[model samples]
Target: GPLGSEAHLYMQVQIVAEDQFCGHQGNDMYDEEKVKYTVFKVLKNSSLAEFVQSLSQTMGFPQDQIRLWPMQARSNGTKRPAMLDNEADGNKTMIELSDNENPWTIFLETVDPELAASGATLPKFDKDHDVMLFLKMYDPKTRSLNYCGHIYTPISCKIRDLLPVMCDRAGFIQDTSLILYEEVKPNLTERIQDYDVSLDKALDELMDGDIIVFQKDDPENDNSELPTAKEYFRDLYHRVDVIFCDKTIPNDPGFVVTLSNRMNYFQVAKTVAQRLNTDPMLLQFFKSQGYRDGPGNPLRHNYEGTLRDLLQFFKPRQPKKLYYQQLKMKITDFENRRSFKCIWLNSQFREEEITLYPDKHGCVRDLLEECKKAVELGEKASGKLRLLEIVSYKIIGVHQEDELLECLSPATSRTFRIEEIPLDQVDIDENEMLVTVAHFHKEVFGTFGIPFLLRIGEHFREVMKRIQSLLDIQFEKFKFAIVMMGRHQYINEDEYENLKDFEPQPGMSHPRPWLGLDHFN
Candidate 1:
C-alpha cells in the first residue's frame, strides 16, 4: 500500500458519561478510564481509557503513537486546566487516561485518511480555521499516567506545499511552519551549485523527531521577500518564528553529508561517463569502503564523520570519474524520451539566448561546434606538459541565480575554467602563470572549474530525456553527437605516479572508483 498521505497523525476526544454517585459535584461525572480514541470520529461516549484501548487493539496503533489534546474546555474559578496552556498552539500536545477524571462528555479524532478509510469516522469541526488542544497520555510500564501537551494543526482546502510530514494528529504543531521542498533546477552548473553541505551540519546537531525552529521577520511585516523555509515549504510566507519536526534521526549524519555528496557526484559522473562512452565500472573502485582502522590514509577519509571535518583535514578527495560516466548514461536516457521543436544555433544571439524552434533549425550545428572548440581547449589545458602553455575557458547559462541558490545568490550564473601546469612550468617572466602558482590572493586564481560546455555535454543526454517529456513529444525527432578526449598529463615520474594515485578529492569514502554503480553488484 502507498504510504499514508498526511504528515502528522492526531486524536481528538470529547467526554460522554455521567458519574455513578456525585450528580452535583463537577468532578463527580468524570471516569478517567472511559474516554474513547478513534481514527476519524469518536461518536459514542466511551471512557477515554476504553476508547484508547479499542484503538490500540483494532488498528495496531500504540498508545505512544496516538497523542491527545482538549480543544474546548470550560474555565474554573481558581485556574484553567494545565491542558489549556497556550504553548500547545504551536507545539505537540496529548491527553491520557491518567489525568483529570471529570465526567464531562468528550470526543477524540485523527487526520489520517488511510486510517479513516479503514473504517473510522470523526465529528465535523470548523472548516479552514485551525483549532487548539491540550494533551494527556498513559504509562503502561509504570502502571501510572503522564501528560501529553497541546498543539494546533490547520487544515486548508487550497494549499499543497505545507502538507504534513508525519500523519499522526497527535504529532501536530500549532506554531508557524516552513516550506520544506523546492523544484530542483536542470543544467550542470545549477545542479552542481547546491551547497547543502551545511544542512547536515545542522541535522547532526538535532535529534530525531526534534522540532527544528527558525525565526523570520514576520512576513506580515514584509520588509524582505525571501520567504522563510516554512513559508517556502508551506506557502504561508509569514515572518513569524516557525517550527517543524526533523524526520531525520539523531546522530545519523550519514544521511545528510556523506550520502548526499556521494550521490551528488555519482549522479553527475554517471552523466559524464555515459556521454563519453567511458566505462563506469572502473570508477566504482574509487568509492570508499568505510573505516579501515588505520592512520589516516593521507589519501581518503571515512564518510562516517562530517564533510566539513573531512574537507578540513583531508583535502582533495571526492567521488570518482565513473560516477560521471553513469550520470551521462542516465541523463541521455532521460532526454531521449523527450521530443521537441527542433532548435538551431543563432550566431547573432549569445549562447544563453539560444532557444528551441518549432521546426528543425540550422543553427544547432554552429552552437555544437563552438562548444566543441571550448571542450577541446579545456581538454588540452588539462593535458598541458609545462607552464609554457595554460588556458581557461568559460561558458555562461541563463537562469543563473535560481539555479543553485544553495551555493550563491540566484543573481549570478556559474562560470567554468580548467587549468594545469607543472611547478617547473611556472613562468616567472609571464605574470599570469606566476600569479596562479604564487597562491597569493587564493580566491582570485584558486578555483579550477571544468569547462561548463563540457559539463553540459556530459549532462545533456539525461536532461534531454526530461525536456522531451516536458515538450510532450517523442525524442526521436532530435539527434545529436558529442566528441571528447581524455588527456592525463604527466609532469614527471613522481607526478605521474602521483596522478595515478590521485583521487582528486578529500572525502571519507570512495563512492566507487573507476567502476560505475551498475557494476557494483
Candidate 2:
C-alpha cells in the first residue's frame, strides 16, 4: 500500500470551514454545531480528490465543490491565503509543512459549482510585487493586541482602498473607518492619519517583520484606549531608552539608542554596530568609569538580559551610559578558547584570567602556573596552590589540574580563584557534589555561576537554608531548577540524594546542579 515517494511522508493538516471564521458575527450563516473542527493526517503527495473523499465521509459534504484555501505564513504574524482548483499548491503547502508536531491549517470553503464555474483567481506567483502585511486589532476595552490576518496588496495601493478589507478582516464596523497605526519600532507607533497615503510610502521606513496595528475609533466611546502589546513568551512592543557613549573613539557625540527591550547582548551588539556602521567584531561594551581612576570593566559578549538591566546595574542614575570600546584585535573563537577570572588570595583579592589553549596552557596545572606568574607568586606557589571552583561564595571543589575540559566552563560570570592549599588534600568529601548557582538578575553571572558544591543526601530545604544564610536576604524566594542549554528541564524537586533521577546536561556524563530564584507569581 506504500508508494516510494509517499512512504513515511505524512503531512498533518487542519481544515477549518469558513463558517467557523465568522463565529464572531451573530448571523445565521455561522453555526457552532455545523462548523466542523478537524485535523487529518494524509500522505504528502495525496490528491485534492482524496481530501474531498475524506471530508465527504466525515461531514457528508458535496465533494464536487469542496474548495481548499492554502495558507502561507509570511515573516510577519499573518498567514497569506490563496485559492487553488488543483493539487499543485497543495503539494507545495505539504512541502512547507515541517516535520514538527504542530499542524499546518488550511481554510475550507464549499461554494456552489456555478459560482466556481469560471477560472480560479489567486495572487500572481512568479512576477508579483504585492507586499503581504499582517494586521493586529488594538482592543480598546482590554487594551490588548489581537492578531487579525494577512493584508495582501500592491506597494502603490492607497490606504483608503485597503481600509474596507482591513475592517472586514479585523471584524470592525466599516462605518468607523478610523486610523491605521504602523509599528514603526517596538512600542513606537506611527499613526497613518491620512487615507490618501500610499502603502509603499507608509511602510518605507519600517523593517520586514514590523507589525501593523488596526486602531478603531468607537462612536459611542470617544476616549478609547488603544492596545499596548505584551505576550507571555515575548516582549512584543516594549522598548528601553539607553545612552550609548562611545568611549573608544577620541571624539564623537554620544547618542541615545532606543533599544527593543527583548534583545539579548549579542543582538544588541550587532544592532549598535549596524547603527554606527563599525565592525561588529571589534565593538565592545564597557562599564562607564566612575570618578577617579576606577578601571573600565568590559561587559561580556554572552550577556543575557535587557539593556535596561545592564544600565541599572552598571550606570544606574547617570540615566546610565554603557560606553562602547573598540578592541585593537578582532574577535575570533576558532578553538573556542575562553578566558575566566582567577583571583589571588595571597594579597587583598588580586585578579587575572588565563585562556586555555589546547597545545599551550592545556590543563589545570598549566592554568595555575600562568596565574602564579601573573601575580608574581613565583615557582613555589604552583605546587602549593589548589584550583577552587566557586559557587554560592563557597568552595565547591578544589581541582588540582586544568585539563578536565568537558567539566569546566569559561563562562564570564564564573570566577576561579587560586587558593594556597597542600596538593594532597584538595577534594570534596564522598557525600558532596558540585552544583551551579545563579541569581535571576545575573544570568551572565549565571550562563552568579560557579559550580557551588553543596553536599548530597541533604534535602533541598537544608541546602536552601544554607543559600539563605549566604545571601543574607531571608525574605527572598529561592528555588533550584535543573537547567540545560539555558532552558528549564526539571523543577520543584526536594530530594538531592537521588540526583540520578534528574535530567543530565549534554557532554559532561552526569547531571549538573542549576539553582535560581523561582519566578512564582
Candidate with the greatest TM-score versus the true structure: 2
lDDT of 2 by residue, 275-366 (tens): 77777777777654434322267666666766656554544234545677665555443223445445665532234455433322257776
Give the count of colliding residue pairs in each prediction: 129, 5
Query: Candidate 1 — which residues are off by over 4 angstroms?
Result: 1-130, 133-214, 218-227, 230-282, 285-521
Cα lDDT of model 1 by residue, 118-185, tens digit: 56543333322443322222112222212222234342221222223221222445453322221111
Which 10 residues in a row give candidate 1 its minimum summed lDDT?
512-521
Global CA lDDT computed for model 1? 0.27
Q: Assess the local accuracy of residue 502 in candidate 1 as a C-alpha lDDT between 0 and 100.
A: 23
State in Å the error of residue 187, model 1: 21
